[PDB]
Amino acid sequence: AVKIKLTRLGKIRNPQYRIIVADARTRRDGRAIEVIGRYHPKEEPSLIQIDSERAQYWLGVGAQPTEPVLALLKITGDWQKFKGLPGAEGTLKVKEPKPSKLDLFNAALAEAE
Amino acid sequence: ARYTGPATRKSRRLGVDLVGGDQSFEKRPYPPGQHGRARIKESEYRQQLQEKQKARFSYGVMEKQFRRYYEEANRQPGKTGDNLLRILESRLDNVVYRAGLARTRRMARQLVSHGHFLVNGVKVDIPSYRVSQYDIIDVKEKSLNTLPFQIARETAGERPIPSWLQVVGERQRILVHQLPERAQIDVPLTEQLIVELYSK
Amino acid sequence: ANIKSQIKRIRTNERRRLRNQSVKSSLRTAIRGFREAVDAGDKDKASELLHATSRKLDKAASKGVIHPNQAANKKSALALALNKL
RNA sequence: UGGAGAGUUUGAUCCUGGCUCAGGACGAACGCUGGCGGCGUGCUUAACACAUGCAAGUCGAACGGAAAGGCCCUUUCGGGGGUACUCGAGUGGCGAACGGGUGAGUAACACGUGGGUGAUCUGCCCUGCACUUUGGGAUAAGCCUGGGAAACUGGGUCUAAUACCGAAUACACCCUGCUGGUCGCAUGGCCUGGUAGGGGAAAGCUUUUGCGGUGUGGGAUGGGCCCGCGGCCUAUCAGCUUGUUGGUGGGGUGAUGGCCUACCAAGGCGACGACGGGUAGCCGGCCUGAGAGGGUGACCGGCCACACUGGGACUGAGAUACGGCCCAGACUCCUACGGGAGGCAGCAGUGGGGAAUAUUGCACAAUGGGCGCAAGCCUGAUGCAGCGACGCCGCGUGAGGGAUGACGGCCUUCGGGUUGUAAACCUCUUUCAGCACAGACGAAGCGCAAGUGACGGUAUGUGCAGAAGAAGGACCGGCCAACUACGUGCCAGCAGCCGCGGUAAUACGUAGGGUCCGAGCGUUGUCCGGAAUUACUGGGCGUAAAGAGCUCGUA
């Protein structure tokens, strides 16, 4: 059975994962058929990217997500779109962008004068 | 580690003043030790090495760090000499010193290492920290009333602040517009000699 | 020898081997009888011997004792041997 | 983006030419020394022998059951019955072929890269279609009993299933005969072509998000087999081959094929190096280099091979079957001498070998995996921690002021100079350590329970005190930064090369001074560079090494 797993990357303290499609018999860090997203739980909103069409294709041929990957697929709405139960709603909480350094630079300059 | 021994020794050996305003170097501008008066044999290697020692004892950078800096500067697509000079100038302690907030580079390094400063809203205590464009270096509120910063904030008539830096706040804020170019560096010595030495 | 599942599997593999051996021996006997009948040269006994042997062959293929391709090869060979005679 | 040279043959010179040196790197070791942190990394030798403990189980929603908890009836307190919540042992299913280790063998379609399969298999997973009919015989367990020292094992009786077995149906499938069209790349393929004959299965459970069984079409995944090309050294290894080269008929296989076999033919390979000998796991990569090239295959990642040595099959969708089976052997252990048991190149650990390489740690919290409807269980995979300056990176050991420049040391031309702004003193700051308080993220996770982090009360943050607890190594004749004094005298010694020791050594030893590095600094070993010194880039052959004695002529 081909499965949609999470392989581990990053250094010791900070695990950063890749959402890979691979056979269930291969090791965690083995060769991957495809890479269809990444997942970084160390961030405050825990960035999640999933390539929707490839995920749809791999679910269509019958890949089985693991529990963390199933949770992620529900969050991004891909799982619901594949099934069709509540609709395809994006529940993804994207990280709030940080203002530019130039904005703060001019703000400080204006605050000086 | 760090170099803690006498500072005047290096100035006397290298034939130039590195602190900037020291009277002992003027009193005796010749190398230290018993044989500080002997004539020397001339060798290109000696001149290149002394130029490198000047550079890395002005900024207080050890040899391994200096070699890393040279590799980084050579890798960059500019020219090696001014790239190395700008990398050396972008250090946090050097920025603090050129900002008029420290009489000498050693005390600037000591202040930075003690975490008396704060870059971009987050405490930084790393003398080798490199400073990028539009960087705001601030003194933390607790240490604003200390005597070092006191005498730094009431003697703002010393060495001019270079163009690429600008103190804007009465609390002695520092703003960095862009990384300095070779024209505005205003440093002793010759970068070409260092480049020649490190290609040997 | 050291793990319970291994000992259980020893017993179960032995029993499976006994069953497979019986089925294969029966198939071999049927093939041998059919070959002898064809050697004799008579068609009718060869005919329903071929029928019974083909039935035994694909019935053993269903049991998983032999691969379906093996049953197909054996049936094709026997039928061609009869047709040639 | 980008190539640096120096010394040494002579009385002196130029050239040729070797040797040596300055650089970089390491799974390193050794000497002296040693504060901290982050991130990595650690048997390169004996694929030597292994004490001990863990490293593969799971399912009661397949089954008979009732050894242990729960509940309920009962009692003489010995216990007795039921229950099925639950569950030891047992039957049954799935897993155990993955994951983890090692590099012995292998010069090979093993590996890398690109193809072919009209010559092929594929459990679980997804998705169409059709089904899920009918009957039977046992047996484990239990009970009784026998043998044996033990391992283990015999007999009688008895019982269930999704265990096992017979038949019906299937005509989607398999085989055979005839037959149509079509595409080819020849055998052939396709149109589930048509048509006649024969034939091939299944299993139930569970009331709850319910799980299952069989055939067949198509996906997806994982393979198998064949081929082109590519990457070692050796003719002081020139012949090699007889299932060996090809055909036909059989057999065999999932599949083609001398894969096997009978007969037939006499072929096939080799100087473009067969056949032998030696060495070797291959690669992405790594190091070096201006590049070309050279060396290498540690970590991490892929493929192969092996699992005490050597053979063999079995079960299964799949087997080098590491923690399976059978035999033979060596070794270790038990034995009542009849016979039995074992396999760390899994994780720690022990002994041995060695210059040299670590804890018999914590947790399933995260990720991956197996079983289960699920809760859940298992996981030395993995996530962490411990040890070792083994490596890379970062930080500290204080900062400012401080003089006709104190003492001491050392040199002296006896004047003085140097250590030296260094010190002493006056202020300042506390990084890191120490103490106190608070205290994480990693978990939009898991769980229908109320909770859940091994790391860890760590990182981190805030206060407290005080410069307070924190520097060594090599070298100093030239290459090649950095010189004086005393001691010794062809000794003791040094040395990479040249060469230094003959009472006045900048070359030995020690002290002052200095330089280069710095929690490191040196030595040894190994590879590349310098080396245009194997010269494709990029060399040569009159006399320096180098034109075969000369022709003809084969590839």
Curated annotation (Swiss-Prot), chain A:
Gene Ontology, cellular component aspect: cytoplasm; small ribosomal subunit
GO molecular-function terms, A-Z: structural constituent of ribosome
Gene name as annotated: rpsP
Shown residues within the full chain: 2 to 114 of 156
Signal peptide, first to last residue: none
One GO term of the biological process aspect: translation
Family, similarity comment: Belongs to the bacterial ribosomal protein bS16 family.
Organism from which the protein derives: Mycolicibacterium smegmatis (strain ATCC 700084 / mc(2)155) (Mycobacterium smegmatis)
Keywords: Ribonucleoprotein, Ribosomal protein
Protein name (Swiss-Prot/TrEMBL): Small ribosomal subunit protein bS16
Protein's UniProt keywords contain Protein biosynthesis: no
Curated annotation (Swiss-Prot), chain B:
Record key words, sorted: Ribonucleoprotein, Ribosomal protein, RNA-binding, rRNA-binding
Subunit composition and interactions: Part of the 30S ribosomal subunit. Contacts protein S5. The interaction surface between S4 and S5 is involved in control of translational fidelity.
InterPro entries assigned: Ribosomal_uS4, Ribosomal_uS4_bac-type, Ribosomal_uS4_CS, Ribosomal_uS4_N, S4_RNA-bd, S4_RNA-bd_sf
Function: One of the primary rRNA binding proteins, it binds directly to 16S rRNA where it nucleates assembly of the body of the 30S subunit.
Family that this chain belongs to: Belongs to the universal ribosomal protein uS4 family.
Name listed for the protein in its UniProt record: Small ribosomal subunit protein uS4
Organism ancestry: Bacteria, Bacillati, Actinomycetota, Actinomycetes, Mycobacteriales
Residue ranges constituting the S4 RNA-binding domain according to the UniProt record: 90-156
Pfam families attached to this UniProt entry: Ribosomal_S4, S4
Molecular function in Gene Ontology: rRNA binding; structural constituent of ribosome
Any one of the GO CC terms: small ribosomal subunit
Keyword Protein transport applies: no
Residue ranges of the region described as Disordered: 1-41
From Swiss-Prot, chain C:
A biological process from GO: translation
Region span, Disordered: 1-21
Alphabetized SUPFAM superfamilies for the sequence: Ribosomal protein S20 (SSF46992)
Keyword Cell membrane: no
Keywords (A to Z) from UniProt: Ribonucleoprotein, Ribosomal protein, RNA-binding, rRNA-binding
Claim: Ribosomal protein is one of the keywords in the record: yes
InterPro entries: Ribosomal_bS20, Ribosomal_bS20_sf
One GO molecular-function entry: structural constituent of ribosome
Basic residues composition bias: residue spans: 6-19
GO cellular component, one term: small ribosomal subunit
Domain of life: Bacteria
HAMAP family in the cross-refs: Ribosomal_bS20
UniProt cross-references to NCBIfam families, sorted A to Z: S20
Functional summary from the UniProt entry: Binds directly to 16S ribosomal RNA.
Similarity comment: Belongs to the bacterial ribosomal protein bS20 family.
The protein's name in its UniProt record: Small ribosomal subunit protein bS20
Organism: Mycolicibacterium smegmatis (strain ATCC 700084 / mc(2)155) (Mycobacterium smegmatis)
Lineage, top ranks: Bacteria, Bacillati, Actinomycetota, Actinomycetes, Mycobacteriales
